[PDB]
Chain A
Amino acid sequence: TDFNQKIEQLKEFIEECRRVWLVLKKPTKDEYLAVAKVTALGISLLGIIGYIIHVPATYIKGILK
Chain B
Amino acid sequence: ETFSKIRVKPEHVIGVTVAFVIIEAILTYGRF
Chain A residues near B (Cβ < 8 Å) = 60-61, 64
Contact = CB atoms under 8 A, between A and B. Distances in A.
B31 interface: yes
Contacts of A61: 29
Interface residues of B, number: 3
A22 B13 CA distance: 51
A61 B28 CA distance: 9
Contacts, number: 5
A17 B28 CA distance: 58
Interface in B11-31: 29-31
Contacts of B29: 60-61, 64
User: Nearest 3 CB-CB pairs, A to B?
Assistant: A64-B29, A60-B29, A64-B31
B18 to A, nearest CB: 15
